[PDB]
mmCIF file of C-alpha atoms and ligand atoms in Angstrom:
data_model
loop_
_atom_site.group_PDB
_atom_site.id
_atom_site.type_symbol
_atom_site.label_atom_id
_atom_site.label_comp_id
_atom_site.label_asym_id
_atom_site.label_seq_id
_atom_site.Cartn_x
_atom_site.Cartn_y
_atom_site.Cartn_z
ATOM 1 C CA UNK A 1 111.416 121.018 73.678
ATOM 2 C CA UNK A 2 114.955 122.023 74.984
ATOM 3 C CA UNK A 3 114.664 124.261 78.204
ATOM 4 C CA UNK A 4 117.227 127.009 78.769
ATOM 5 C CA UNK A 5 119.051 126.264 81.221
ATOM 6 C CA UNK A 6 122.062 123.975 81.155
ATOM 7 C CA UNK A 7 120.857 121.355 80.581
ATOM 8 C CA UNK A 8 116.668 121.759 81.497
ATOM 9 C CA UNK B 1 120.216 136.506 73.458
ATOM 10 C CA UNK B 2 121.262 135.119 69.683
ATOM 11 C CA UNK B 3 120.987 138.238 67.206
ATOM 12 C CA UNK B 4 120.927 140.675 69.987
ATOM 13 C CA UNK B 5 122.274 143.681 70.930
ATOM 14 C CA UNK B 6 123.487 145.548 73.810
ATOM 15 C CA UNK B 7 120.857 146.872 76.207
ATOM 16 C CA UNK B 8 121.027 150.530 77.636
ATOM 17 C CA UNK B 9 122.482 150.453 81.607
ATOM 18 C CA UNK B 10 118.584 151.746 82.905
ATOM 19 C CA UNK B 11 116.510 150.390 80.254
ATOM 20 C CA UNK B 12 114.699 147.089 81.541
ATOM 21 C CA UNK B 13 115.843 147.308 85.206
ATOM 22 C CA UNK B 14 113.263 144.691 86.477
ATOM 23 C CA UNK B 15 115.747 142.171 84.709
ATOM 24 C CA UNK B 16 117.480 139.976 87.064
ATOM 25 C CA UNK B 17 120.352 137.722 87.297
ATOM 26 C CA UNK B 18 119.849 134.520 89.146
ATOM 27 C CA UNK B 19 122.743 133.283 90.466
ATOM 28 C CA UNK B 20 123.951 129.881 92.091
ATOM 29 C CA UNK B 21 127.058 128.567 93.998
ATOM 30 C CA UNK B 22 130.135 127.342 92.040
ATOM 31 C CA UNK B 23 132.962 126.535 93.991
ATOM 32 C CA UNK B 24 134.411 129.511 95.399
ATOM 33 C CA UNK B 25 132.344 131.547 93.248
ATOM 34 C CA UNK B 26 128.696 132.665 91.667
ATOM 35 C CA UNK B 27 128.168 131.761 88.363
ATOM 36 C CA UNK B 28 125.029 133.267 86.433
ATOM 37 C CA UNK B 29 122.100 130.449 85.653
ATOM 38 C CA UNK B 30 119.152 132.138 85.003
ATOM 39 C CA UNK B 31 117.217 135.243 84.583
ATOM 40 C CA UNK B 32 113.847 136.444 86.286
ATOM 41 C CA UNK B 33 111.950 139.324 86.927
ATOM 42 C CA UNK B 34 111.656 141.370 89.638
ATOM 43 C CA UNK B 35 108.230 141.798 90.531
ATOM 44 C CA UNK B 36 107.908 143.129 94.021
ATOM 45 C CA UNK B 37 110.524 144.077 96.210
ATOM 46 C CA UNK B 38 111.036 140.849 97.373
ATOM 47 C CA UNK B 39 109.654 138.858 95.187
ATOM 48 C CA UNK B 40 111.083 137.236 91.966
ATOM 49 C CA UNK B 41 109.727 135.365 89.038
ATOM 50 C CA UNK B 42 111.361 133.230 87.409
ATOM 51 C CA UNK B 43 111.604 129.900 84.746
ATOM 52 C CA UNK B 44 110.289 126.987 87.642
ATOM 53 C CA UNK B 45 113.346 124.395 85.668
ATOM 54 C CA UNK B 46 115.778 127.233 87.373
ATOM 55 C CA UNK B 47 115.457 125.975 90.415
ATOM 56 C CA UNK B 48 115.055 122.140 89.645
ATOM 57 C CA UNK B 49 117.525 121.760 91.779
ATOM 58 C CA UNK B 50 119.278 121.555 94.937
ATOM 59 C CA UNK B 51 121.639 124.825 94.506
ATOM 60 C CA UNK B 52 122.265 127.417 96.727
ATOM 61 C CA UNK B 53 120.895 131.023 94.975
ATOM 62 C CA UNK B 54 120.845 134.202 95.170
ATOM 63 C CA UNK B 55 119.589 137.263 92.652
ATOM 64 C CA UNK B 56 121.214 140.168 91.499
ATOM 65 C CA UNK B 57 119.598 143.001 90.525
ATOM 66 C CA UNK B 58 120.913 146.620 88.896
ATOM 67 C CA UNK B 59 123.219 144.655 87.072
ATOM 68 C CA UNK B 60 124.322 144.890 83.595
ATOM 69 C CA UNK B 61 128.085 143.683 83.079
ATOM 70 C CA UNK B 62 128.467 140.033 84.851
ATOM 71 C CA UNK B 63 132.085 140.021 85.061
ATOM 72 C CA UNK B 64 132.859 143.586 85.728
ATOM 73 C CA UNK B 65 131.856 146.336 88.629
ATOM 74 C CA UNK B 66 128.838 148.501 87.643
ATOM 75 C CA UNK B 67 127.876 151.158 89.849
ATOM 76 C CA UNK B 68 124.592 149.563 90.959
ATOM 77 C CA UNK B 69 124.499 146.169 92.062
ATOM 78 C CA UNK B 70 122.347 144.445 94.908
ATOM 79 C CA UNK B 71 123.039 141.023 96.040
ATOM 80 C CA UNK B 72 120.366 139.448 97.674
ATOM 81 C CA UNK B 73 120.039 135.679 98.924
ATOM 82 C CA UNK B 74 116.846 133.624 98.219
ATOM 83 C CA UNK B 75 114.790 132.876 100.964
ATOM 84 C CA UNK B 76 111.658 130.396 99.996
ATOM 85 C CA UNK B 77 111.069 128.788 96.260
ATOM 86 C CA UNK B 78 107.610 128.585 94.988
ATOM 87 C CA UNK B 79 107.156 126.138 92.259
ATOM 88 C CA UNK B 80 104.116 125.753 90.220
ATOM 89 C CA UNK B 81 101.945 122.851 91.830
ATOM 90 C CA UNK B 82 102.007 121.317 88.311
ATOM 91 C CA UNK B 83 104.812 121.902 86.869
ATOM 92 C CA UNK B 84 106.765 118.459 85.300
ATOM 93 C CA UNK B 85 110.089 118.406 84.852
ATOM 94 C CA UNK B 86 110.053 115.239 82.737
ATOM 95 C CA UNK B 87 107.355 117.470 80.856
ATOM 96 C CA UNK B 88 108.521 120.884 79.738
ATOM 97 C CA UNK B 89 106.305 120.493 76.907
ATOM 98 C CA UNK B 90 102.987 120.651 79.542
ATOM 99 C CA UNK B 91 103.296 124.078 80.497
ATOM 100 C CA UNK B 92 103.297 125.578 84.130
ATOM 101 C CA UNK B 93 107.055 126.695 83.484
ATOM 102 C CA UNK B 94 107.020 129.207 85.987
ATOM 103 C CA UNK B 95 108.559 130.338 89.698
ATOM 104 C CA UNK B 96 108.185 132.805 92.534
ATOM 105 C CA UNK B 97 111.394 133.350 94.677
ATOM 106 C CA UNK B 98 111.166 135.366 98.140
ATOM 107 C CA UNK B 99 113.732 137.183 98.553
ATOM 108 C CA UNK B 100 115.787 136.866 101.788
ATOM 109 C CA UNK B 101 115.614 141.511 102.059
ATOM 110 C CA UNK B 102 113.847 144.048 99.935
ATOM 111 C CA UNK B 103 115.767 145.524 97.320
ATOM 112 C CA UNK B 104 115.868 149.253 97.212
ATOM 113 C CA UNK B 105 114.354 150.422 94.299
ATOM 114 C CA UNK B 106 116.316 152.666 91.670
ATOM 115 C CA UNK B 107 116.863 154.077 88.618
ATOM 116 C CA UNK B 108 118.475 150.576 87.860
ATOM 117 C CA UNK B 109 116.251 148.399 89.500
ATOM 118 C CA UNK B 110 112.529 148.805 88.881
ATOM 119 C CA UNK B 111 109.285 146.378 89.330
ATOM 120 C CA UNK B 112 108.571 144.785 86.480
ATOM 121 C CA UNK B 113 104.581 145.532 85.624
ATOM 122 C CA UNK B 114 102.342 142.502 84.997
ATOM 123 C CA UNK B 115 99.880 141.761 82.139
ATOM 124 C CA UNK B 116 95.877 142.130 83.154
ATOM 125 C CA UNK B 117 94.650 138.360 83.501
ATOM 126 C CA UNK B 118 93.936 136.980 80.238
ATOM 127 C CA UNK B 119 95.628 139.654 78.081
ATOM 128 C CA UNK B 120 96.620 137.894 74.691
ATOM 129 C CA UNK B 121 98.268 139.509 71.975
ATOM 130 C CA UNK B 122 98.201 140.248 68.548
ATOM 131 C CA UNK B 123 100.356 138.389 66.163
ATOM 132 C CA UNK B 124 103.378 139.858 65.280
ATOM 133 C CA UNK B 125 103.089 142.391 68.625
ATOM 134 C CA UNK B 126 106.387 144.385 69.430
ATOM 135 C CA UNK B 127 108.404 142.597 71.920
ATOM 136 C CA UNK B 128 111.574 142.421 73.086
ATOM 137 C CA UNK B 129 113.704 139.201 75.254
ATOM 138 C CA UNK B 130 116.321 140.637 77.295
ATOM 139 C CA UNK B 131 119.225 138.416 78.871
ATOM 140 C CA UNK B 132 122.956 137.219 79.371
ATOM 141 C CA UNK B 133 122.415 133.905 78.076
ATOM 142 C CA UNK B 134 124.854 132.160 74.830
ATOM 143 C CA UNK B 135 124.834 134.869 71.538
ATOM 144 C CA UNK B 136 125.342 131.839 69.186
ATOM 145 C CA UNK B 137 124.074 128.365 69.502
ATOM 146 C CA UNK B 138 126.666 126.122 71.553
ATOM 147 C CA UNK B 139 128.448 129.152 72.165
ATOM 148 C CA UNK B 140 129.005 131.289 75.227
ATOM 149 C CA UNK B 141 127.241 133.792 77.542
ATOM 150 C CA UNK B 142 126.806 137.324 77.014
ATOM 151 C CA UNK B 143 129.078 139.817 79.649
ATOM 152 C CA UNK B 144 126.865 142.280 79.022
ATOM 153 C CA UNK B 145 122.814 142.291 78.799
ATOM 154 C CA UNK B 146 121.547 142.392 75.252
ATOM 155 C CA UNK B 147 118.624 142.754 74.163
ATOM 156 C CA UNK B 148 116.379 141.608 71.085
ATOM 157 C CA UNK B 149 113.417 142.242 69.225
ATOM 158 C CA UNK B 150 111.220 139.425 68.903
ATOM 159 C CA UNK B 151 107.938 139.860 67.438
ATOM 160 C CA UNK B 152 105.184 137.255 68.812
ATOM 161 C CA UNK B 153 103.561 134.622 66.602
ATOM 162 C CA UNK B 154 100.069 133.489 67.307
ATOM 163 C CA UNK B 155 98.761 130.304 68.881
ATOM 164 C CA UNK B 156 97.123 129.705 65.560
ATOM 165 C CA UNK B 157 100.445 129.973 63.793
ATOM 166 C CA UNK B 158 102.461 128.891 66.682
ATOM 167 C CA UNK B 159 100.737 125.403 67.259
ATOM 168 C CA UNK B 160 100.602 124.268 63.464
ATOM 169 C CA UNK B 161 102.346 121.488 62.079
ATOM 170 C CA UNK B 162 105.703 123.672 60.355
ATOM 171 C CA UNK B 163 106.065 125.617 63.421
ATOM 172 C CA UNK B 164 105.908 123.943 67.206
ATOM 173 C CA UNK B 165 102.635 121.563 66.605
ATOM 174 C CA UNK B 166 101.537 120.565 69.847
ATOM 175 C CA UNK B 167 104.688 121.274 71.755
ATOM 176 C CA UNK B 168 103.085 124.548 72.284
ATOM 177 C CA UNK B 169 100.364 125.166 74.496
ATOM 178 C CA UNK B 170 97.400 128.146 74.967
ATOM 179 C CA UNK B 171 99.389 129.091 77.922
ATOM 180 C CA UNK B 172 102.434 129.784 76.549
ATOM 181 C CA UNK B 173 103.811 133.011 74.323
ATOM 182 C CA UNK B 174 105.622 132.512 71.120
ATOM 183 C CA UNK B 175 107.520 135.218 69.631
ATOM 184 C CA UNK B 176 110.116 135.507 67.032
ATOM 185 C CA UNK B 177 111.276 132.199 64.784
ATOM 186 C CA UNK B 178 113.337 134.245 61.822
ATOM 187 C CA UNK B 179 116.210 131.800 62.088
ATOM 188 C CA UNK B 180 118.526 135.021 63.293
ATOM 189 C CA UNK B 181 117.405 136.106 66.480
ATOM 190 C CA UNK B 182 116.112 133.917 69.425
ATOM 191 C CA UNK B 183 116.427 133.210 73.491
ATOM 192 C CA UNK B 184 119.366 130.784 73.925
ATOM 193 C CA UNK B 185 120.927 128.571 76.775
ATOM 194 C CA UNK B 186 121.494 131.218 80.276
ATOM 195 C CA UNK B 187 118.278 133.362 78.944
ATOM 196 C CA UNK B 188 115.235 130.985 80.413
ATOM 197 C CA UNK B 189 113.720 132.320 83.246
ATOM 198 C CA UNK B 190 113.705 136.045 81.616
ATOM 199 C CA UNK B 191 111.171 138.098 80.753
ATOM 200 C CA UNK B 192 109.636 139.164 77.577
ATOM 201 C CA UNK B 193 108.725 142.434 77.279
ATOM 202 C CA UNK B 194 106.028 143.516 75.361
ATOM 203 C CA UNK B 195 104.381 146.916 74.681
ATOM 204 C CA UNK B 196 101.087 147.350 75.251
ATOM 205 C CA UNK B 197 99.220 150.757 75.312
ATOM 206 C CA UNK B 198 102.524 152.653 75.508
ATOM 207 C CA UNK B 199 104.263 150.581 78.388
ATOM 208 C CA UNK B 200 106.157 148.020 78.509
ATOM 209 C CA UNK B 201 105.022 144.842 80.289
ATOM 210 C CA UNK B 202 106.144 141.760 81.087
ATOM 211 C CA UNK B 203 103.939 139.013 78.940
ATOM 212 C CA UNK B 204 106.434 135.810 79.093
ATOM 213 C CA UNK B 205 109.039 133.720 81.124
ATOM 214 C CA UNK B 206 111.427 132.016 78.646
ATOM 215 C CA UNK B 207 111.554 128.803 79.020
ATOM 216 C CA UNK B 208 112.410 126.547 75.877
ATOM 217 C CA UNK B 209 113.667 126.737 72.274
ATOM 218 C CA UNK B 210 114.362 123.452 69.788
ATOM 219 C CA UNK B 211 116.448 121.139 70.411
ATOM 220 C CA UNK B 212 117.835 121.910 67.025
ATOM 221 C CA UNK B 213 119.938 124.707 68.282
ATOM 222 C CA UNK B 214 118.484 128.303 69.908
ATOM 223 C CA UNK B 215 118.038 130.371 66.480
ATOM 224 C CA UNK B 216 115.960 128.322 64.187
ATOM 225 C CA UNK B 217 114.071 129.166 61.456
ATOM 226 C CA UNK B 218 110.051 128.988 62.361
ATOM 227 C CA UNK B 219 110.774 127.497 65.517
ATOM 228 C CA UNK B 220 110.173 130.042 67.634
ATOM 229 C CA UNK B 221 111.651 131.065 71.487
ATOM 230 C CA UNK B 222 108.796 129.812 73.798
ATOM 231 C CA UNK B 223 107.420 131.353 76.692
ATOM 232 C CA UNK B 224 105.146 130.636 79.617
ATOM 233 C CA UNK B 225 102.345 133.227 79.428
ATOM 234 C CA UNK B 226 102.281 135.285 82.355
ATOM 235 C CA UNK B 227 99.084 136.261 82.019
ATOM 236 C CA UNK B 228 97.786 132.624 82.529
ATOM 237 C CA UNK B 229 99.140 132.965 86.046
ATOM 238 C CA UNK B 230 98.188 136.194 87.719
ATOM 239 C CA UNK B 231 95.675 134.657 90.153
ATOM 240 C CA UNK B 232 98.383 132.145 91.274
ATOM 241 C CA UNK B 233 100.993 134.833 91.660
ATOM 242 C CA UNK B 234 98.897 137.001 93.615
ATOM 243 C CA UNK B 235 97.737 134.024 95.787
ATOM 244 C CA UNK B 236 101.274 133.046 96.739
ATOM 245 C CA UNK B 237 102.706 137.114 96.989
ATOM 246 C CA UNK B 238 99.328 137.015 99.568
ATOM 247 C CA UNK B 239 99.953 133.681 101.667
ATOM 248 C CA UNK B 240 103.961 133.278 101.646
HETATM 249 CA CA1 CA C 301 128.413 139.729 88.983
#
């Protein structure tokens, strides 16, 4: 996998 | 930052908070690093996107006036050449934004110095992730920078079958995985900051925990490895 930004 | 705590006003003032457009207002996104005076670097699924950005630096409360704010619009995006969106997993998680002025440089705001080409560390190597991102899974972002510290884990460790597997790649930095502290959603795009013969340098971008939640137990916060990249940083700081 989940990347950190919202959502990627 | 889950597990965090709150940073000093002047101590990691390469941190940055990127910044996009939100109806009549800025809302925070992402962090990056400053790393020249007009140059940023940052998590490349930041700015996956058609958003209008801009960076500010010397700043420590989002919500409230500090003394020492710079607001700065973004000028060109450099994305890795092969970076994937549809594969985090594949590595090459990492940005360069020109900034649209130079940023006067401060007690507050500070370059961020760059690992030597290479560099790999130790397991279980002093780090800390800095950011405003969510302090609990599904919960909500920080006002004020905190800070963590997140020990890295090996490749070795990293990249076998209880911990990431394959997910992780040679060119990325793990570091922590306690099930207490971790990166979490608003923190990608951050630096790590490691210590390495008595200074602090900047040895990841955050760019992805589990999908389980942010602070999971052996699944550590992932980071592209900056040191995989200096050639390509200094190649586009030297043609753009
Ligand atoms: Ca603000």
């Amino acid at each position: 996998x989940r990347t950190t930004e919202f959502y990627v | 930052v889950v597990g965090g705590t709150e940073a000093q006003r002047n101590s990691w003032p390469s941190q940055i908070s990127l910044q996009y457009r939100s109806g009549s207002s800025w809302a925070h996104t992402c962090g990056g690093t400053l790393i020249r005076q007009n140059w940023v670097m940052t998590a490349a699924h930041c700015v996956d996107r058609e958003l209008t950005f801009r960076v500010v630096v010397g700043e420590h409360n989002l919500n409230q006036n500090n003394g020492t704010e710079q607001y700065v619009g973004v000028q060109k995006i450099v994305v890795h050449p092969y970076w994937n969106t549809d594969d985090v997993a594949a590595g090459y998680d990492i940005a360069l934004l020109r900034l649209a002025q130079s940023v006067t440089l401060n007690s507050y705001v500070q370059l961020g110095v760059l690992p030597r080409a290479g560099t790999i560390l130790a397991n279980n190597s002093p780090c800390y992730i800095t950011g405003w991102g969510l302090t609990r899974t599904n919960g909500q972002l920080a006002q004020t920078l905190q800070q963590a510290y997140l020990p890295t884990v090996d490749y070795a460790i990293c990249s076998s079958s209880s911990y990431w597997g394959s997910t992780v790649k040679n060119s990325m930095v793990c570091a922590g995985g306690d099930g207490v502290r971790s990166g979490c959603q608003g923190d990608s795009g951050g630096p790590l900051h490691c210590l390495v013969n008595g200074q602090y340098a900047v040895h990841g971008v955050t760019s992805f925990v589990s999908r389980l939640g942010c602070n999971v137990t052996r699944k550590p916060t992932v980071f592209t490895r900056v040191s995989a990249y200096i050639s390509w940083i200094n190649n586009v700081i030297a043609s753009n």
